[PDB]
Amino acid sequence: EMQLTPFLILLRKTLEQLQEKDTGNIFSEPVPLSEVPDYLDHIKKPMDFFTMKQNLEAYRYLNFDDFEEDFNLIVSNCLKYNAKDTIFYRAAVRLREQGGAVLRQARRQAEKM
Ligand SMILES: CC[C@@H](C)Nc1nc2ccccc2n2c(C)nnc12
């Protein structure tokens, strides 16, 4: 029960904060299926920050849970696809931790709306 514009402004800011936590930009764009040809054999729904931005501006995120669900896919896909002893796997663990704090704060501000 809130206004659409301030909510989208908040998701835009939150998405920028999450992208800032991904310092290697390894989640900024879709996993290049031509460089990882078996990726879609394992990953039911790829997700990345660029796609999240397009979804945001297409009005696909009208509540905080749908935004956070796609962030969680970025993390879970990476944990699933990559072995534990890799930089990619540990980067998804770090993003889960650092991103989770960004999301809790942003969700509090959405609840103020
Ligand atoms: C051996 C498969 C590894 C290299 N997987 C990934 N490669 C990526 C390459 C470019 C951008 C993202 C990539 N990625 C992500 C995200 N999760 N796993 C991989």
Side-chain angles (χ1 to χ4, degrees), residues 2-43 45-79 81-104 106-111 113:
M2 52 180 70
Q3 299 171 34
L4 177 61
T5 290
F7 180 69
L8 295 185
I9 285 168
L10 170 69
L11 293 187
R12 284 180 192 104
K13 171 189 184 176
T14 305
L15 182 60
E16 282 181 345
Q17 293 171 322
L18 295 169
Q19 207 134 15
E20 287 189 28
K21 300 305 185 184
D22 172 23
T23 61
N25 294 156
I26 67 170
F27 304 117
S28 66
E29 300 179 316
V31 177
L33 300 175
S34 56
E35 304 176 9
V36 189
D38 73 332
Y39 186 78
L40 266 192
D41 288 330
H42 301 273
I43 297 308
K45 179 171 184 186
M47 187 53 53
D48 66 273
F49 284 136
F50 181 75
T51 297
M52 285 190 71
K53 174 66 167 190
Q54 313 313 128
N55 292 341
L56 192 163
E57 304 300 339
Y59 304 107
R60 303 213 149 82
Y61 302 139
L62 302 176
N63 54 66
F64 205 84
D65 284 341
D66 283 334
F67 176 89
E68 187 169 329
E69 189 174 51
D70 270 348
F71 170 75
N72 286 340
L73 267 178
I74 295 174
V75 171
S76 55
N77 290 342
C78 188
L79 296 177
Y81 182 75
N82 293 281
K84 288 182 90 191
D85 71 340
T86 63
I87 292 282
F88 286 122
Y89 188 101
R90 213 49 181 72
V93 172
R94 191 184 65 183
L95 183 64
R96 187 182 66 204
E97 300 176 344
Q98 294 178 354
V102 168
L103 287 166
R104 172 166 189 171
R107 184 186 286 271
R108 293 184 233 112
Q109 305 213 265
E111 290 162 0
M113 300 172 180

